[PDB]
Design a binder for this molecule. Structure first.
Ligand SMILES: [Ca+2]
Ligand SMILES: [Ca+2]
Ligand SMILES: [Ca+2]
Ligand SMILES: [Ca+2]
Ligand SMILES: [Ca+2]
Lengths: 286, 286, 286, 286
DNA sequence: TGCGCCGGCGC
DNA sequence: TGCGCCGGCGC
DNA sequence: TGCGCCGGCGC
DNA sequence: TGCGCCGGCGC
């Protein structure tokens, strides 16, 4: 049959189709297009043909398509990542946090101290104002790793006891919390202004961490390379951007002769800023 | 037996005593102390006593203790990290880079674009000037990961063929290099001004990466908490600092009844900015 | 009569009213409210009463209200700033750039080199991909300062000739461009996601500058302190946020007893992150 | 007469020759040279010759040349900047801070919150640890601006009463302190590692400011371009570097026929990363 | 070579 | 309540 | 006091 | 064409 990552990739698409997240309205507008832009329209039509989309229905409201894209991205990650246990073992959990959560990063080892700052600020309003703060990281999807018992550390050799390596992050106990492995931002579609919150979130993770920075990634179904470029280009905040259908996007850009769009596409891909959704699970194993 | 990490820790200490790196001169000054300062003198002597330091010899040139401390840290990480294959598998290398070689990080995937950038500056002086920046990132010790065969991704299951997950960093071939896993900076002793180059370096890794940030840590044998804090305190550049002899420092701070410095020790240690050398191998397995 | 800044402040409001930028629809929704949020509705109603708004008309499309708010903010700045010539002299120009421009910062001394990087990237696609780039700063409104002749430098004393101070930024000649004094972002209303492009723009200005960083400021008519807070709180990117009607906002928060909103309001104002529109001209003279 | 800035420049040089800061020891080593290196030896001797350095004495202790170079830079800036009141008016102070005093920038408006932050850490150790960071920003030389009376804002026109522009930074009273205009770091000579503390400091000013960023510059007497470049190259932390004797350096680089170093000089100078001491007073008037 | 190592100690 | 989701489209 | 200055020179 | 504007509102 298919290789399993290939099957999960199609499962991923099938859920977008089945849910009418991806569909075409009766004016021929594919639902991830900017219907008032010809290039967006054409690129999204082609991807949707390549994905064998057939349903005709009205575009879903954006809150609905945004939410569903996250859940569906979340299910793909969890399912594929859990097959990489021999390359990246651990007690992994993949969670869609939500578009309504907050303070959630403080749940995790590298950012726990942010609980203490918040509580300090609410108690002392002078401290609140004097503070820079910035404890507002609300990821769409997290991947976390729970902590390991000595039994696991000492699986094959007597490596540790209670008198050595007493601060190691992976060691369960002393009120240690789970590690944040990845923050995954989802963008069903992009406009260059609303795309920038992924950068500020990446930036917040970078500047406030105690310990190893998580993976910071963005997944998008945006059809146009230019809008993808407002989040993908540049370094420092975002590790890499992953497209819901890269291969399909490549094909359509080639057959349409949007030559600047194709050039921008290769700049990002060859520039290590844009990958396929199927590359994400393995990139989470590095 | 002792746990193996406790044995490794004692081997790291005995390399510093045996190699005359950590020793006491004819005036009673321990060789990581700042002899002009009573507290640094007393804290360092206290650490040497708890390490059972016995040798009398004159302080080595700075350049020699610097290099030697670095080799011995490098050997500790390599021997101890190799025990952790079941929690962080792979084909790992640990290397002690040096000022001799140039453009070292650019041999690794997340920073390879820096070669192209330098070649571009080199041929066009107008471009060299426009970009401004030249010199590039040179950590003391790096840990790198070699890439993985398809047979090993597919060890258990038919996960990938050559038509899926084709940009994934860990996958061998496709114009791929090894991955930088960790940048480890060493400071045998510290002065607050010359500590800061570990921060500019950390920042360079951060801002320039394509892919997940490496581990960015500092290992130091500095005796006084105030000097350690010049590098330890704060977040954003350094993941964590590792003391060469944390338990002994804590113990001497208590015995010398230096409460202000004991406070600062705990600010750092309780604040997750400072740990023992022995936490580092497990911290690199996150 | 009124002090002149007070008159410009009312002129500013009158243009928002006259243009129906600020008005109330026939359901009682004030046009800067989020009509589906009760607190937004109530706060905007009160400000609009305090500004003596009377017109009833349908909300303008967002592209129209956004554009007009910029022009109107632009006219206020220019007009008031030009009265500060004795505190901040110079050949000043205030320009609404537009929501369609690009590369415009490269027009200015501190960012000119960005022209060279763009031209280098389009010529060499390998260089394009290898590049980090990030020359995408599109301010809404700029303030610039043209360069000064020796006659002005030497107005009262013979300070300079052609053999001293030959690189001074303010000196006209040798193909020197005008200085960027300020970038002013306008946000008629806010949602926390679309607010973050002001941060990335501020960040781009910070990281790419050669010479003194411009003022980086945000002007907003957003009624709710919480949405204002998604751009105002935190430091490093934005110098300060200026509200189109702060005094009115203070009054209404007090009379409504939204006590957490009032607390957040004082956190920002007392925390030097939020000011009135009338404070901007003087803050541009520092 | 010479132009006044040319006279000031010669007075700055003669303070270094007369004060024995810049001199040649009995071995022919000029006192800002690294005697072990032929190029630094030759470039420094060449600069001393063009400055008409005549004194023979032994090199002063590092601590003394460091401090003395700093006082003399400070005096140059103060005397020359005072001539620029017609292009940058105000009530300016120039001061040479020192390691003796602590929490110096916090006396200025944009960084006053740092006092509150430190007081908060000091009373609550859990908070001190949560925040992590303690120590704070200590530039070598600062230029500050005192605040302005209402009579002077209203000198020409009735601009403001007490009901408008009530949070404006420049306006005296209302719980206002002076403004930090410039942070000036000095490095009599450089080594690449100890250069980097001017970068961490620059970054601290950047990231922590409430209001416009101060001028952030470095003045250095370092002879070799490679060492100057360790601080000069790049953007984001330092606005610009200023050489103590740029014309003389350029001239010696040409006469010594050191083409590689001449290149690097131009990369820096043409790239707007390096200028002469004499450009600094006008650069602070931007 | 020259970069970046650490040390001594003045302010 | 409220935060952040995407969509329509003018300038 | 102790922080942050610069210097010598090994690798 | 295309970039960035704001608005409606679900989850
Ligand atoms: Ca999202
Ligand atoms: Ca080092
Ligand atoms: Ca805007
Ligand atoms: Ca200095
Ligand atoms: Ca010495």
């Amino acid at each position: 049959m298919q290789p399993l990552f290939t099957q999960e990739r199609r499962i991923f698409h099938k859920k977008l189709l089945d849910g009418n997240i991806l569909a075409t309205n009766n004016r021929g507008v594919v639902s991830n297009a900017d219907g008032s832009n010809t290039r967006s329209f054409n690129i999204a039509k082609g991807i949707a043909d390549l994905l064998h989309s057939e349903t005709v229905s009205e575009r879903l409201p954006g809150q609905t398509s945004g939410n569903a894209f996250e859940a569906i991205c979340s299910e793909f990650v969890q399912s594929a990542f859990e097959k990489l246990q021999h390359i990246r073992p651990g007690d992994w959990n993949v969670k869609q946090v939500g578009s309504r959560n907050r303070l959630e990063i403080a749940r995790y080892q590298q950012y726990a101290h942010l609980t203490a700052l918040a509580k300090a600020a609410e108690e002392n309003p002078e401290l609140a104002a004097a503070l820079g703060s910035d404890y507002t990281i609300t990821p769409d999807i997290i991947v976390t790793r729970n902590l390991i018992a000595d039994a696991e550390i000492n699986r094959n050799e007597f490596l540790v006891d209670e008198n050595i390596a007493t601060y190691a992050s992976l060691r369960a106990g002393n009120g240690n919390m789970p590690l944040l492995h990845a923050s995954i931002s989802c963008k069903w579609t992009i406009r260059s202004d609303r795309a920038q919150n992924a950068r500020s979130e990446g930036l917040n993770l970078v500047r406030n961490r105690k310990g190893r920075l998580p993976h910071i990634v963005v997944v998008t179904a945006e059809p146009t390379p230019s809008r993808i470029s407002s989040i993908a280009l540049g370094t420092g905040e975002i590790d890499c951007v992953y497209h819901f259908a890269l291969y399909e996007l490549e094909q359509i850009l080639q057959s349409l002769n949007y030559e600047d769009a194709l050039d921008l596409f290769y700049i990002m891909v060859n520039g290590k800023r844009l990958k396929d959704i199927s590359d994400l699970p393995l990139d989470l194993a590095v």
